[PDB]
Design an enzyme around this catalytic site. Sequence first.
Site, PDB file in Angstrom:
ATOM      1  N   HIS A  45       0.825  -1.219   0.000  1.00 32.16           N
ATOM      2  CA  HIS A  45       0.000   0.000   0.000  1.00 32.16           C
ATOM      3  C   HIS A  45       0.846   1.251   0.000  1.00 32.16           C
ATOM      4  CE1 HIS A  45       0.182   0.195   4.598  1.00 32.16           C
ATOM      5  NE2 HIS A  45       0.209   1.483   4.288  1.00 32.16           N
ATOM      6  N   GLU A  59      19.688   6.156   7.524  1.00 28.78           N
ATOM      7  CA  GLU A  59      18.926   7.288   7.977  1.00 28.78           C
ATOM      8  C   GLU A  59      18.596   7.155   9.443  1.00 28.78           C
ATOM      9  OE1 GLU A  59      18.232  10.291   7.573  1.00 28.78           O
ATOM     10  OE2 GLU A  59      16.680  10.411   6.000  1.00 28.78           O
ATOM     11  N   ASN A  61      17.731  10.595  11.370  1.00 30.53           N
ATOM     12  CA  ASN A  61      16.950  11.795  11.595  1.00 30.53           C
ATOM     13  C   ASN A  61      16.478  12.272  10.245  1.00 30.53           C
ATOM     14  OD1 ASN A  61      16.098  14.519  12.119  1.00 30.53           O
ATOM     15  ND2 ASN A  61      17.292  14.459  14.011  1.00 30.53           N
ATOM     16  N   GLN A  64      17.728  16.120   9.689  1.00 31.27           N
ATOM     17  CA  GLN A  64      19.137  16.536   9.914  1.00 31.27           C
ATOM     18  C   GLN A  64      20.089  15.598   9.227  1.00 31.27           C
ATOM     19  OE1 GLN A  64      18.102  18.009  14.513  1.00 31.27           O
ATOM     20  NE2 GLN A  64      20.235  17.387  14.043  1.00 31.27           N
ATOM     21  N   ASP A  93      -0.191  -7.500   1.672  1.00 33.70           N
ATOM     22  CA  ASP A  93       0.367  -6.146   1.754  1.00 33.70           C
ATOM     23  C   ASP A  93       1.886  -6.174   1.805  1.00 33.70           C
ATOM     24  OD1 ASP A  93       0.534  -3.430   1.761  1.00 33.70           O
ATOM     25  OD2 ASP A  93      -0.445  -3.172   3.760  1.00 33.70           O
ATOM     26  N   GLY A 186       2.834   6.344   8.581  1.00 34.04           N
ATOM     27  CA  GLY A 186       4.195   6.577   8.251  1.00 34.04           C
ATOM     28  C   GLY A 186       5.129   5.478   8.730  1.00 34.04           C
ATOM     29  N   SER A 188       4.097   2.257   8.200  1.00 34.44           N
ATOM     30  CA  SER A 188       3.752   1.246   7.228  1.00 34.44           C
ATOM     31  C   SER A 188       4.927   0.891   6.386  1.00 34.44           C
ATOM     32  CB  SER A 188       2.680   1.786   6.286  1.00 34.44           C
ATOM     33  OG  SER A 188       1.407   1.855   6.974  1.00 34.44           O
ATOM     34  N   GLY A 189       5.038  -0.397   6.105  1.00 32.00           N
ATOM     35  CA  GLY A 189       6.093  -0.900   5.270  1.00 32.00           C
ATOM     36  C   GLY A 189       7.333  -1.264   6.018  1.00 32.00           C
TER      37      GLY A 189
END
Length: 240
Positions: A45, A59, A61, A64, A93, A186, A188-189
């Site tokens: 999705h 990643e 932050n 920043q 999904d 946010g 999700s996945g």
Amino acid sequence: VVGGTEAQRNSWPSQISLQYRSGSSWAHTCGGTLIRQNWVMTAAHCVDRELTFRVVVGEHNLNQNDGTEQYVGVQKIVVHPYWNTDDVAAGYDIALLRLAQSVTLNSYVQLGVLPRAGTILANNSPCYITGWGLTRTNGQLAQTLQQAYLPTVDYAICSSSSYWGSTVKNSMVCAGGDGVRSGCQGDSGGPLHCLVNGQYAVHGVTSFVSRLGCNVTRKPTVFTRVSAYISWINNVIASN
Ligand SMILES: [Ca+2]
């Protein structure tokens, strides 16, 4: 993640940020798990929209310079062929993203280990959700990667009437439901990391929360069960 804590920067090196181009910038939309140097596992999705996507590994932050990021375009998207965006409850999904380049591995960037096919966790097994998703229902994305301890809720309990009922399938993992900690939009996945025989593996791909809210008691966060899709994943990578 509602009710999370900031992850140490090298705890979850397989976590990625899936972002889309928006104007002259990029916006985080979902998590994912790096599973090969050029492949990411995420939720179907997350890639329903016809956007330009990139992956950020290393990643921590979103807001920043961490000094560890590698930014790479998404070259190919392979969504599970049984996915239907208007029926998340049916399952499927999951999607794989082939990256434009192979990322370089280091303490911030590692492959996620997947469970053996068929593995189902006992009720109340220890797991962490990670992600940059909202920190409150109807809130805002986290800046720093968050983790929350979300023990599993087995199928028999999760599919009972006061939990998710019929909406949860055996091809899913439920975790949490304590009314305090959860995934949220946010997340999700991204991964659900569960500790088994001394090692964390990614047992879940975050799929959905209640329409009522993220941290709703007896509405644990629901994940695609990675161990149901091992053959699928391997077939996609072998054919691409
Ligand atoms: Ca950063």
